[PDB]
Design a binder for this molecule. Structure first.
Ligand code: PLM
Ligand code: PLM
Lengths: 42, 269, 250, 178, 269, 42, 250
């Protein structure tokens, strides 16, 4: 079970509750030039 | 379902490396870890960010509409314009993103109760209800026995009382590529008309009525609708709304306070 | 097999009549592992300074003595560097070995039960109110049971229920040993760390309680020594501490 | 100051008076402490009932380029009273910030807790510590420069932060139909 | 499912072996078998200790809560703090272990009955009930028509009367690694506050109400909740409680008797 | 049947009522040194 | 090369204008070896608790200030767990890193000399008598020099001889650094353990003395800040202790 669809329509399906994907780099690091933590920022 | 990062052992250090020092004017958030500034042991973390996902966060029913119709003029049926800006509980959650794509799974709860009168002796059979979704531009009924109720093309659901609540699924039915919760524009090209998100909201209406013709004494019913978004995708996170809502149509607000007042700067309760 | 010798730190305990030591639940105390750890810091691990025998005050076993109880680890405060580290540390872990000494001649009779009850909870004599924290722990002298029902804002020290609302004779389920004057004069119990959370604050939590109850009354004839002392010695083992801040005055 | 722009300004001064008193002090607890309750981290934390991980706080010095000074910022683990002197605050997790070209320093709280998770609501069993700042050295400015400057603080979570239990936020109420 | 050990044949013996003699001061329970001290035959035992397991012992529903709410101020809804120290039947069974991990399978039984009055003539449709579990720290409703009832995030169950009883499953939701039934400590770090297990119990509240708005005459309902632990693990066995319970909050007791009085030492009934 | 799960969650499963494992040595024999029944205890 | 970052324990020091750190005599501090050891016991070696930065009281550098001196390691007592271990331990070993901070604008001028003198001995103003131990060490405030000859049962604090009977300008032989307001604002000196015996009592022996003497007087015009503070921070390194007994009240 849990992987059998009894309805042809795609909207008639269970929610995707077992997906884990992350990408925090979009907001935390938006700078064009790479910054190294050990090296001075400026 | 991966776990969070583990902690790495550290020791005393004296060198020219400066992980702590940084510049906040660049617009970048520092990535310093606790091991970088302190001596830490090695621990294995099995904690998982499994319930912080958008799909799980939005995956729970919430009330969107409530109205009453009676069985004994225009009070025999209810009319609702499908919008998600009528209940504060779900409005605040869905205003954290600018654009969103999702598929709703609507359900309804219908209850009936006899009205208090001088004479209450009556025997009635079971009751049946009909719910009809009129597509945008379709004819709207004006009476309980109007001709629009025969749903040749429009969808309809019939639910006899005493059974399980009805449930239906609706796909992405937006003209654009996503649902625009916030729209900064005017309806007309001359910068006139209605300013707000009402222009882009073109969802149809909903009609509920009693199938039974009449009763010896008045009976009133209440319908509650719950929405659950699934297969959801979100874009452009937004800060949470601080001020309480005033009107459903617009985002007008009153001046409020950022945080609760404290006695002094160095006051620890 | 009667002779046994225990050495820990700079202290040594020697016994000539005793029984085999009892390890609590069959598990020797050890250090916390990385996988089971939850804290994120470098624990301080003193070895010789905070892991050694500490001899508590002694008590006299009279003929009508009903019994005594001690509530560790708070009783071990203000003794050596073990208590000092407790004041400066929010969290800690430790294991203990308990040695109880009581000696008599061949013309004396009596029996003692030594048992460690984990998470023992004491009820008040007045069911409608609570007692101050002084009644449970004093940290200097043992608290005594009683042979009759008592009243007030105090624990029910009746030996029949032992203050826990359970039968006194059913306490043998927990790790225990017996001291019979005809056979042995010393009892040794090794206990591992038992708690729901990996680490907890020592001051506000009482891990275990040591109870000594005489099932057989002490009896002797004229001319024999009437002062029989009972002494308890406990030694912490595998002490570990996480979290450093200012000292807590308590 | 809760309805103005001065709530975010931590004033600093150059003087000989009151150099032995704390600059600011507040509770580390993110769930209910008024200082950081309504921040971005706090707002998402109020939709949940359990939390764990580490938090990092950075400070920006908004002053004249000619000004120089040092500051001491400390985190005291729970179990004792709030420190009332710099000698009490130097026995915990502390870092010494030298104001200069970088103009920012980061302090990290290394998740010292008895259990794996804590509770967002205030409960005596699980509580965090206190954050305090002190004067390592006085602020020195050349003649012709402003005497007083300001400092701003930013708070964010680390990469080991997580929340498990799901609840509703207590910051929203609807008295009647909109 | 293995069986118990079989009996081995024995014969007359005269030697220096002393299985019967032992020392009880060591703290060890003797392992003597009946064959060691008597002459026994050979029998094959097929008896199995299959129902003595903790999982099977705990695997049976027990009542935990009972309250009444009415349909016609604060009597229209019921509030319960989730605790397992309110019914003696299940409290005694769960106090034989210090720490335990388990998953409950809650079910509810709801019944309604009309109240005795001078006038009883009424005709009412079927009734519906809602049960809401408020997570710790969540807002608590103060009225039947309060805004907290729309469960945007909190769970809820709707059960129309006449159908099968509702059932739900709840996982391990404890902050620590197990449920501490007995806690010997104080809430505050200064050895003050509340002494007992109440400090560690942080479970949320439960709310039950009537979905129907009103009835011509008063109607009262009763809800009973049953818990079944499954996937259970136990630690640190404890002696059974002798004295009857007095208060749910604490373990206060009165002095009782170990066993029933007999006429004499050598009295056989 | 009896081994098919129709629900993804692990708590949504039947109780383990066919498991028999025992270890009485933890409580009956907690002594450090081994004791033989035939040999004298002391 | 101006920027430098030092992390020890839970404390971190950041500097943006400084010079390369000076290691005392070119040897980094380390732990005692077995061959060079003389004691027979297990040394206790705290790592995070007793090895971290400790910020002392600050002082104001006025135009007429003659200088100040501190006598470690006694000045480091009663601060943290470093002083507490000293009371309970007869012998100890440690190494130190000294960081001195003093900042000014580009319109201020002045120079400071920071030098650590090992085994510095101070003579009395009255050559025919001795001074009490309070004059040498107070453990709370810095002792000040003077620009003229003084009398009494006190040390000769004249800046000309510095209290040691030697030229003030010849102190550069010992490890030292200079703080010039035009160039730098911080000085850092790392010192190893220097003593004739491998271990010695900390209370009764003064290993080294930190002296700061302004060779160039501070000068500025009207409108500039007149309050220039000087702060000293020291961090013990590789602390080792042998010998445990009752605490010494001193
Ligand atoms: C009653 C049976 C027919 C019901 C048809 C489905 C109800 C129509 C709702 C469609 C819109 C759903 C999503 C809109 C949300 C939004 O406006 O952002
Ligand atoms: C009514 C639908 C929602 C119901 C949510 C489940 C009920 C919450 C109970 C959770 C705690 C169960 C176990 C606690 C036992 C204990 O406190 O030891």
């Amino acid at each position: 079970y849990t992987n059998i669809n009894f309805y042809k329509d795609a909207a008639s399906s269970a929610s995707n509750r077992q997906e884990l994907q992350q990408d925090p780099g979009k907001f935390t690091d938006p700078v064009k030039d790479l910054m190294v933590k050990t090296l001075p920022a400026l | 379902d991966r776990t969070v990062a583990n902690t790495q052992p550290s020791g005393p250090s004296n060198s020219k490396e400066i992980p702590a020092l940084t510049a906040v004017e660049t617009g970048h958030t520092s990535q310093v870890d606790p091991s970088d500034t302190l001596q830490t042991r090695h621990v294995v973390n099995f904690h998982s960010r499994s319930e912080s996902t958008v799909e799980n966060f939005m995956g729970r029913a919430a009330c969107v509409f409530m109205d009453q119709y009676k069985l004994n003029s225009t009070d025999n049926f209810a009319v609702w314009t499908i919008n998600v800006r009528e209940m504060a509980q779900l409005r605040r959650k869905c205003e954290l993103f600018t654009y969103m794509r999702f598929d709703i799974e609507m359900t309804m709860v219908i209850t009936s109760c006899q009205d208090q009168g001088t004479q209450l002796e009556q025997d009635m059979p079971v009751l049946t209800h009909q719910i009809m979704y009129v597509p945008p531009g379709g004819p709207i009924p004006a009476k309980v026995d109007s001709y629009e109720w025969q749903t040749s093309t429009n969808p309809s659901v019939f639910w006899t009382e005493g059974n399980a609540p009805a449930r239906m699924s609706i796909p992405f039915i937006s003209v654009g590529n996503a649902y625009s919760l916030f729209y900064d524009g005017w309806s007309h090209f001359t910068q006139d008309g209605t300013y707000g998100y009402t222009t882009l909201n073109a969802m149809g209406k909903l009609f509920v009525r009693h199938v039974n013709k009449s009763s010896p004494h008045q009976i009133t019913s209440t319908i509650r609708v719950y929405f659950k978004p699934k297969h959801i995708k979100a874009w452009v996170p937004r800060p949470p709304r601080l001020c309480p809502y005033i009107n459903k149509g617009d985002v007008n607000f009153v001046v409020t306070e950022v945080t609760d007042a404290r006695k002094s700067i160095t006051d620890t309760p | 097999d009667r002779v046994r010798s225990m050495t820990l730190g700079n202290s040594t305990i020697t016994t000539q009549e005793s029984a085999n030591v009892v390890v609590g639940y069959g598990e020797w105390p050890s250090y916390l592992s990385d996988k089971e750890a939850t804290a994120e810091d470098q624990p301080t691990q003193p070895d010789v300074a905070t892991c050694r025998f500490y001899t508590l005050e002694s008590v006299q076993w009279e003929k009508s003595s009903p019994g005594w109880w001690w509530k560790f680890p708070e009783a071990l405060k203000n003794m050596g560097l073990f208590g000092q580290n407790m004041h400066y540390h929010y969290l800690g872990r430790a294991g203990y070995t308990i040695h109880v000494q009581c000696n008599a001649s061949k013309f004396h009779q009596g029996c003692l039960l030594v048992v460690c009850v984990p998470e023992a909870e004491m009820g008040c004599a007045d069911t409608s109110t609570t007692f101050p924290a002084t009644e449970l722990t004093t940290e200097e002298e043992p608290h005594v049971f009683t042979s009759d029902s008592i009243t007030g804002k105090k624990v029910q020290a009746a030996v029949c229920n032992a203050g826990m609302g359970v039968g006194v004779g059913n306490l043998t389920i927990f790790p225990h040993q017996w001291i019979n004057l005809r056979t042995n004069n010393s009892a040794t119990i090794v206990m591992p760390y038992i708690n729901s959370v990996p680490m907890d604050n020592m001051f506000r939590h009482y891990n275990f309680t040591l109870m000594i109850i005489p099932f057989a009354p002490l009896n002797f004839n004229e001319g024999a020594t009437a002062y029989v002392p009972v002494t308890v010695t406990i030694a912490p083992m595998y002490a570990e501490y996480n979290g450093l801040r200012l000292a807590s005055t308590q | 100051k809760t309805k103005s722009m001065e709530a975010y300004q931590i004033a600093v001064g150059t003087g000989n008076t009151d150099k032995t008193k704390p600059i600011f002090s507040f509770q580390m607890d993110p769930g209910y402490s008024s200082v950081l309750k309504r921040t971005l981290l706090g707002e998402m934390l109020n939709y949940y009932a359990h939390w764990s991980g580490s938090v990092k706080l950075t400070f920006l010095f908004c002053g004249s380029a000619m000004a120089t000074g040092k500051l001491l910022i400390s985190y005291s683990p729970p179990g004792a009273s709030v420190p009332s002197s710099r000698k009490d605050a130097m026995l915990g997790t502390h870092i010494i910030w030298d104001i200069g070209l970088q103009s920012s320093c980061v302090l990290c709280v290394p998740w010292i807790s008895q259990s794996h998770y804590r509770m967002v609501q205030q409960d005596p069993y699980t509580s965090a510590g206190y954050i305090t700042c002190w004067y390592q050295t006085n602020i020195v400015v050349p003649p012709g420069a402003p005497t007083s400057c300001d400092v701003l603080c930013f708070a964010s979570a680390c990469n080991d932060f997580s929340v498990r239990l799901l609840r509703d936020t207590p910051f929203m109420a609807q008295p009647g139909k909109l």
